[model samples]
Target chain A: PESADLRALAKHLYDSYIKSFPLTKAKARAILTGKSPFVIYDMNSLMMGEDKIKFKHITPLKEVAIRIFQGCQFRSMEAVQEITEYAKSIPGFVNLDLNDQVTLLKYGVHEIIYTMLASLMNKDGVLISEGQGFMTREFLKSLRKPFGDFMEPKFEFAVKFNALELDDSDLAIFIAVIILSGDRPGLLNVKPIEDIQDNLLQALELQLKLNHPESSQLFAKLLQKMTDLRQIVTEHVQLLQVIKKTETDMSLHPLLQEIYKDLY
Target chain B: ALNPESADLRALAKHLYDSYIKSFPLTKAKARAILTGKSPFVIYDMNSLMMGEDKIKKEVAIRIFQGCQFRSMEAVQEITEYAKSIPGFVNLDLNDQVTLLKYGVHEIIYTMLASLMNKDGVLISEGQGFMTREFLKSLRKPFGDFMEPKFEFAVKFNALELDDSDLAIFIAVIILSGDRPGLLNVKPIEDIQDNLLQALELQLKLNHPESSQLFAKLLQKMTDLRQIVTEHVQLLQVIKKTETDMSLHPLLQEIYKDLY
Candidate 1:
């Protein structure tokens, strides 16, 4: 029951706390074709003091392309905000120095994003336009250079990870464990994070035991998949660095740029 | 008084070991070659070993030692193949994987040396025979001293009766360590290691259920293995100074480069 409390809290947050984007492919297409009434998804917040950018004048293909990515960028920022709110409830996380909290989120946000992305992903591709559009792997690969490069690994990871069948309750606690990891570079006061991690891990273990009682190895396997997610994030950083070197047209959200700055 | 935390760690450790061990070879064929004294070797020196230093002068000792180095190179090739065979090992940043293998080969060799060992000494010349610990101790200073810890550790390690499957996982655990110098990605490396450590602990429990302390003991053995490699590198430096004419395999030189 004690462990169940942690899972219920996590599942509750996952189910109710994050922003939901419910645009279907039909709506995405209608917006792309100018046949549907749609407000332009704004970019000023992510633009970080730049002029308010609008997609009204862009061509259909380019407009959809811009929206798809900007949609992801926008969603990623919201995900970070939600995770910060989630992190505060993680018992000891809110009490850490402001710098340590930032460091944890800095290294941790991408990993949590990819972990959450598994829900919206499958073997072929991932959902975009906030679950409104599906981007196939073949279609992404057809794009110039690295757009294809980035999603292939994540798709591969998500497919295998989905086989584990971790529902929201498991994922909620799992995400908490990822944030408070003691081994993240430059963690100052590690013992508290480690202590919190131990608590959450036991809670996760007990939760998995209650929920996935038949699969004895699920706990071990999930930790390994977390390892896989960490590698995927590293691969993402490398691809981004390559894009940066080539001066690609895609713009990164300022927060993403800042997080990747340390990695590069 | 039952510690739920350690008990959970033990259960997780066991399952982790079981799952990974099933995916890879038990390495019994290689182990059997040593066990049956049937593997091929370039030098078969049972006669020389039986006769002691009379048949083995300085030059002869150097020759046999060189033969051992060649066998070590062969073992490393085997190690590389097993490393590549590990499920997610190659997926690591390529440079990081390279660094892990480079730093890890020495520890792996020493740990696996236990398989070729008896209370007396280690098998050399592809198990054609073994050199007694005393016989190795009789060689010239650093050369003599270089093998002592290996022989000691191997004999004690063998007492645990870990089968080839256990050793294979143990080897993978050594190769994927997070703390190797020059590793670009430490977090994932640590994750892989932590899982394997649990797996190893579990394997120990299954293989030696009565020996509650065996898993922790082997961890201390890893520490000992590292110290053994450091000393081995130190002696190689001494050997480099005294033997100007003796050449080493380029692979050996590269592996030892950082350690030296």
Candidate 2:
């Protein structure tokens, strides 16, 4: 009875996301495996050309690290846009004044992307960075210093979280929880934010307590992983701070610049 | 994962059990046991010792060590309760509080550690057990060298001597950090932090109207706070190697893993 209004409303938002993104286990697996959906690196690139003829252009490691981060930025900004558009459809989200919404997007966007990243993550497997070419975790980690620390922790959490094997609907409810979170810094209309959060969490709890008899600890485990993901992101920002200070040639994408600006 | 609000709170508490809520556990138990089970202060047990002819080993180091250990545990509990005293803190997500406390408590402990310090070294039992800065350097390989930055910051911070009112808000700002890496409830948490920051600014303004640039200078202290904590965590990690002998109370171990 508590979040009945919220359950109905949040369910609508969750359904709309399903309609838009429609993520699936198979598709997520493919993204990680470098199958159809994502591009994999070329094996032929290592072979010397007979002349100028080449199957692939071998990128230097410095260039490769920059490219990985560039792709990361583009993908992250795109997600913010996509989620903000989706937020417009959710009830309380659209009703929020413009400032809080943007503030929410600025702070909350990373959590959603990282959360999704965790779900699709594979520690041993490759993360489909897929610039003009692909880079493997092995290649990436071996390439450099702070970058390895920057990248490895993300993979660590992703694998741990993905192991839980949450269903599509559950992830949907979880995303609602992320989007409508009241804890971002400058909220004016907080009661409404908490109202939405309370309902969404209540719905998730309601669903969890029902037929899914698998590790009921799954929800608690999710909260625990949230801490790891958060700390890893903190480490990532610290690495970025070093990069920003030391490397003059590396140009940070604006969105990442914006996020890291807040970090220091 | 249980929502702090919601109807079946009691049922959820029963289901999950309470282990997840408390970050540092064993020390509270250990501290209480040390207090209630045995008198923590008696210095020597010559009768049970192998020593003869009235000479006995003084328990000075171990006494101060346990005393400091209990003190640190109490510091964490006090600061946590301090964070809750700030209005609107309780309204934030329960897990959010846990997550913030996970990092902030360490940050504050080292701050308190800095306050407990002097040029000589950290004072134990209010100078009854003074561990000289040189003595600590003699004990550990690199740890004393690593603590140099913290010692410098403590000296500077102590020189400032900001009052209790400013630190109350300052500690709250540190704890409720909106930008601290990962947060499920960023806006609400941010709201609390922003309000406290504003209050700190205003308090600074009112107190030091003629002091000129005092507020900006105080804000700069936070950067130093972060640097010192990093140094502190590094030193805590060193202790991890020798933990088999030194044997941190369970809660202390929790702090190390949680922050380090």
Candidate 3:
């Protein structure tokens, strides 16, 4: 499992990347909420590579995969969840593997991020994601035709709602999902709930503002739940740290070396 | 001899004599020895003497005279007029006048000797008695001021009608004292000495036109000698001027004391 500190670092990097590059936030939210395949494809080309296939050199291990995957707009929550999970599962998900480590060192990750961010940020909204029409279940259905049964279940869940249209709130939720999904029990080491609570709260507030007054107001509730979920994750990290401390130091754990190892 | 034809005869005789002397095996040395009274006989060529008589004539003699004495523009005009007064003078080509200028008039004894010694074209007399008399005569108030004292010998001797033996002696005297006695006078004798030397050289070329070919080679030698003597004297004057300004080289001041 990836260390919680490493996952926290990745979360911090993702947060910083989003804040600095607003267009990335927009495009990514657009893709996840299923707006235009054009936006999705172009964003994916920048983020995930063509056909959702990444070069081993380019996406050698996890940090690269996470960086690429995070920059993209996913077709649905299911697609976002799938790729984020794939990113976190890669070894050294928060850093990089050997081959990618070399590329990262040679052409720094900062330069690569800046170049990709600038390109994505300069695109005309109408030409890319915006004018492609709103995200709707029907619109998304047409896009996923090739995936067929592969995304059938996700499609069904997506159909129950109109489709998540991108807004500032949707953008925050997308970032929240990317961050939370990378934590432990998902893929990355989970951070303390308190540390990410502010980010989660901020994301929740934006999500609430953009929430559709629909059947169940699911997006509103989902945003609230994400806020609460982040609190739980933060507590989990605190507990994990405490347990890890007791287990590692015999003087501190004095009663049990066995319990400390088990807690780890 | 007063008639131009008889003058020509004398000129021809001298010409023959000059050619004979020049051709004789021991003539140059014997001539020199004779002037010093060291030779027994002056070996004369009879063949040259006979030809000399036959060749002399008024036109020929006048042609020779015109060759010798026309040193300046005025002298050239005087000779040209004398030639024109002759009956057939107009028949002579311009080249003939040029030839006459190159070879002195053989009628006059001094000019004839000059021609013989190849000094007829020169203004200076190589004969010393004539040169010394000329130098002394030039020292007179009017003459000395007008003419160079050192060259007085050349001017006077050049006009003298000397015999071959006397002519040789005069030439020797010039070689020795031309630069000295005149220099002793108050006026600078250097320019006169140079002029005298220049005259001797011109006469030598005029006399030996056939031998030297247009006097070109002889003139070059004369130019070189004149340049050397003239430069030497000029440099001495420059040094004197420098010493005078500095009050140094007391000997220089002493040399010029009598003159001043």
Best by lDDT: 1
> What lDDT is reached at residue A110 by model 2?
70
Against the true structure, what is each candidate's TM-score?
A: 0.50, 0.50, 0.19
**Kept native contacts, fraction for each prediction:** 0.00, 0.00, 0.00
Better of 1 and 3 by TM-score: 1
lDDT by residue (tens digit), candidate 2, B87-135: 6778888888877887787677666566555565654443233345655
After superposing candidate 1, which stretches have Cα over 4 Å from the reference?
A1-71, A248-264, B1-260
> What is every candidate's C-alpha DockQ against the true complex, given to 2 decimals?
0.06, 0.04, 0.00
lDDT of 3 at A18: 53
TM-score of chain B of 2: 0.67
DockQ winner, 1 or 3 = 1
The C-alpha lDDT values of all candidates are 0.65, 0.57, 0.32
Best by DockQ: 1
- Model 1 chain B: ten consecutive residues of lowest lDDT: B38-47
Model 3 TM-score (2 dp): 0.19
How large is the C-alpha RMSD of every model relative to the true structure?
13.7, 15.7, 54.8
What residue runs in model 2 are displaced by over 4 Å at the alpha carbon?
Answer: A1-7, A22-26, A30-62, A126-135, A250-264, B1-70, B73-259
Error of 2 at A84 (Å): 1.6
Clash count list over all predictions: 3, 11, 37
